Amino acid sequence: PEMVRGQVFDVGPRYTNLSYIGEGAYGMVCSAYDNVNKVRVAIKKISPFEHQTYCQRTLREIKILLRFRHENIIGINDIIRAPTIEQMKDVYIVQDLMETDLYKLLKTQHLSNDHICYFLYQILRGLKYIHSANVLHRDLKPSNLLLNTTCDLKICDFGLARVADPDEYVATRWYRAPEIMLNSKGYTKSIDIWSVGCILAEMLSNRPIFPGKHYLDQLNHILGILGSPSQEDLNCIINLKARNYLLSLPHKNKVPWNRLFPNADSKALDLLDKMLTFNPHKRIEVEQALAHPYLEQYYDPSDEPIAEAPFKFDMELDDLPKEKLKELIFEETARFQPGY
Numbered sequence: 001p002e003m004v005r006g007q008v009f010d011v012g013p014r015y016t017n018l019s020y021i022g023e024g025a026y027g028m029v030c031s032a033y034d035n036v037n038k039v040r041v042a043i044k045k046i047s048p049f050e051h052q053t054y055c056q057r058t059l060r061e062i063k064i065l066l067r068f069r070h071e072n073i074i075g076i077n078d079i080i081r082a083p084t085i086e087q088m089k090d091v092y093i094v095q096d097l098m099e100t101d102l103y104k105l106l107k108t109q110h111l112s113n114d115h116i117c118y119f120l121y122q123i124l125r126g127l128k129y130i131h132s133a134n135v136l137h138r139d140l141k142p143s144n145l146l147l148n149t150t151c152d153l154k155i156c157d158f159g160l161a162r163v164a165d166p167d168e169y170v171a172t173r174w175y176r177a178p179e180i181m182l183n184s185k186g187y188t189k190s191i192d193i194w195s196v197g198c199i200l201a202e203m204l205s206n207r208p209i210f211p212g213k214h215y216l217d218q219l220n221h222i223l224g225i226l227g228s229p230s231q232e233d234l235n236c237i238i239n240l241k242a243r244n245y246l247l248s249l250p251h252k253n254k255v256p257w258n259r260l261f262p263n264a265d266s267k268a269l270d271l272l273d274k275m276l277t278f279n280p281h282k283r284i285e286v287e288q289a290l291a292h293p294y295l296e297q298y299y300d301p302s303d304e305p306i307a308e309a310p311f312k313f314d315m316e317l318d319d320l321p322k323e324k325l326k327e328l329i330f331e332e333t334a335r336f337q338p339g340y
């Protein structure tokens with residue numbers, strides 16, 4: 001049993017030469033060599049079974065990634081856990097080895113317009129796939145857009161994903177759509193477009209555009225740039241208590257995107273504006289985003305696959321005890337066990 005920084009990594013003998021990459025709130029990620037397939041991999045050690053929401057996120061991510069197959073969405077190559085459910089305290093998810101992520105990349109490099117356009121197209125190509133499966137990612141941010149040595153971008157971390165139906169503690173809420181700060185329900189695919197626009201804006205300036213300390217401070221950032229909501233924009237707010245609060249704010253002028261990002265490609269700022277619209281109904285959808293003139297050179301519907309069939313969780317996870325969720329995780333991973 002190899003160890004890394006004092007953590008047991010019980011992935012041998014198929015995976016060896018483990019190197020530390022980083023950590024989450026309940027796991028450690030290493031790179032490793034897969035001796036069977038003769039390829040370099042990432043292995044995420046997950047230890048969720050003492051916490052019910054960790055068990056939700058683990059089940060969600062396993063269920064959605066196993067079902068997804070797209071070039072811009074991280075896959076699961078293999079899963080290692082113990083042969084009996086009493087013995088399983090850890091799940092190891094094997095994935096494709098990635099170099100870095102867009103959070104790290106933006107810390108050290110300023111992206112030219114060509115690279116911003118290349119990255120945005122890949123984000124939207126993958127998102128087009130996710131949404132066509134009737135799934136919301138719900139947590140798009142720079143830190144979980146991974147890049148590999150080929151400079152290929154892959155969306156990851158679907159632990160907060162939900163199946164869309166229009167009729168949870170997060171690290172950073174800076175990419176959250178305004179309607180999530182305002183309402184408690186009714187989240188549509190629109191919330192992912194907002195996040196993608198928040199990421200576009202960050203690639204244009206190497207600083208986040210709406211970095212509030214809490215929900216009220218986050219909203220003042222949004223309105224301090226978008227300007228005050230229009231009359232029609234206030235009507236689309238569902239929660240009257242929240243809608244009433246926006247009316248009490250003093251009027252704020254809309255800062256033109258040309259002034260925030262004086263040096264951005266005009267075609268990009270136009271698309272940013274259609275992604276950072278306040279009204280979720282008027283916000284641009286993922287196909288229209290892909291067809292936008294900023295991505296003319298990459299747009300290619302014939303090379304932008306979609307999901308075979310809409311996702312259906314087949315069960316809701318919100319009320320299940322963590323012992324039930326461990327049972328569901330054990331079942332979901334049986335297919336990677338020899339002899340299933």
Ligand SMILES: Nc1ncnc2c1ncn2[C@@H]1O[C@H](COP(=O)(O)OP(N)(=O)O)[C@@H](O)[C@H]1O
Pocket residue numbers: 021022023024025027029042044074095096097098099100101143144146157
């Ligand atoms: N498939 C992968 N390849 C390379 N590195 C990976 C990876 N999956 C996660 N990582 C890395 O491990 C750390 C992320 O751990 P993780 O739990 O999955 O995501 P996070 N940052 O939302 O907490 C990050 O440094 C991330 O770049």
Ligand SMILES: *[C@@H]1[C@@H](C(=O)OC(C)(C)C)C(=O)CC[C@]1(Cc1ccccc1)C(=O)OC
Pocket residue numbers: 099100105109115118147148149150151
């Ligand atoms: C790839 C990208 C990058 O960091 O790649 C890794 C492999 C993660 C270091 C960039 O920042 C910029 C675009 C990138 C590299 C590149 C290629 C050609 C000319 C300039 C930069 C890329 O698009 O390569 C496919």
